[PDB]
Amino acid sequence: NYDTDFIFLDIESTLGVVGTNSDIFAEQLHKLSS
Amino acid sequence: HDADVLCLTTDTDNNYVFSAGVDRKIFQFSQNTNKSQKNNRWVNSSNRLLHGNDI
Amino acid sequence: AVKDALRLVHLPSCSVFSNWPTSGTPLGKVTSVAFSPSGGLLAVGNEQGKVRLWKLNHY
């Protein structure tokens, strides 16, 4: 592949490469609006 | 059927209805299963091509 | 079919309301209608494309 690496394909077809109160209220409101 | 249904009959206890016409096949409709009976549902059970031209 | 053809009847009594619609309520050629499920609120849409909105103050 054209950026100085070489890619290979396995036989189980895996491609590989060789290369170089506030936060409490906030959490409770986001949990109540969930 | 694929075309007209010229003649059709039933059995004694009305658990089967057989039917046939100009597309030379006989269809059998069944109501034997007790769920089909208590729900009063017929099913297109089977189909036989045994004739030559019509019935 | 005709202009301003809408009536509100009151049931059980089945007696049509006499004070609305009057001759100057802009119903138009009433072609669809829907009551709102909560506020007591008619919405009547006519042939020229105008949903007019009334609020039934009893609710």
Partner: protein, 329 residues
């Protein structure tokens, strides 16, 4: 006209409590102003003829006080969705304004009566009324530490009130229309602005002289001043935001706006800002994207130009591309 009746940021400016009408019943919603840190569940009012006049945040489970129009302040916890308590004045007049300092809550009435409740005791301490102030619709508690001296009411004409003597100690020439905003700016100045005018005026609370007169270019709807009086961001009637930069320094008597922000869509459609919020170096503007859902934007206002316009992505003819389908259908 805009579908949102009431809106107020909390202090720290991270939640906006906004009261709208939803098919002849008003409802109170609370939205977080930056999600990176939609809320679906409101508090509906029950009657069609009961309606929220004024609203204020308390700072300590966080809650709102909604001054209603039947003479009751509803204290409403936002983390539940029920009203915690209903403070009731003895009468049925709509209450025009509330303000709190600590655990002490003051409300004005439309019978021109002043009521003091203790939010810790849940009781009405003091009920009184003062001569020659008779169409009040705003009060502010001048912060004097733990002491809750010096109310400041406005009736088209501001007047400063000693409460332990129950009298008017100074009177200020206000406007010609009823006052709509009345806010304390430092511990000696206050800004005031009226219904349907574009002239704010800041008064000295010790002498009475108008220091300065701030001129927006459209009718002022709401304002929010920064925490140290170096900025005042007014949201106007045409839906623009105008930032007066350091409005208390030496444009000698009447000052125009320093920065002016508006929002347009990709179409050209100007969407209007309601109720923005300024602080140090960071400004939070807000608008309504669909019919009644608030959207927000945090703008670093110190480095944007004078005349600024956000260009937001709002649908106008966008061809509906389902994600399960390429362009040729």
């Amino acid at each position: 006209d805009s579908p949102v009746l009431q809106s107020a940021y909390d202090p720290s400016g991270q939640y906006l409590c906004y009261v709208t009408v939803a098919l002849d019943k008003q409802r109170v919603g609370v939205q977080p102003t930056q999600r990176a840190t939609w809320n679906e569940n409101f508090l509906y009012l029950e009657d069609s003829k009961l309606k929220v006049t004024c609203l204020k945040w308390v700072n300590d489970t966080v809650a709102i006080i909604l001054g209603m129009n039947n003479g009751e302040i509803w204290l409403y916890s936002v983390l539940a969705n029920e009203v915690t308590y209903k403070f009731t004045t003895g009468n049925s007049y709509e209450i025009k304004d509330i303000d709190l300092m600590g655990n002490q809550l003051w409300c004005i009435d439309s019978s021109d009566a002043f009521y003091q409740f203790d939010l810790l005791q849940f009781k009405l301490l003091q009920h009184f009324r003062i001569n020659n102030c008779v169409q009040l619709n705003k009060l502010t508690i001048v912060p004097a530490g733990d002491s809750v001296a010096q109310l400041l009411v406005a009736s088209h004409s501001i007047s400063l009130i000693d409460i332990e003597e129950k009298k008017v100690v100074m009177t200020f020439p206000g406007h010609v229309s009823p006052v709509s905003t009345l806010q304390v700016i430092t511990n000696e100045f206050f800004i005031s602005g009226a219904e349907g005018d574009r002239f704010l005026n800041v008064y000295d609370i010790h002498s009475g002289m108008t220091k300065c007169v701030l001129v927006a270019e459209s009718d002022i709807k709401e304002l929010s001043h920064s925490g140290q009086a170096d900025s005042i961001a007014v949201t106007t009637e045409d839906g623009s935001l105008e930032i007066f930069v350091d409005p208390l320094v030496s444009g000698n008597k009447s000052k125009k706006s320093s920065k002016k922000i508006q929002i347009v869509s990709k179409d050209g459609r100007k969407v209007p800002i309601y109720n923005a919020f300024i602080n140090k170096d960071l400004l939070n503007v807000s608008w309504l994207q669909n019919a009644t859902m608030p959207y927000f934007k945090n703008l670093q206002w110190r480095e944007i130009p004078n005349e600024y316009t956000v260009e937001i992505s709002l649908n106008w003819n966008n061809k509906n591309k389902s994600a399960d389908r390429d362009l040729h259908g």
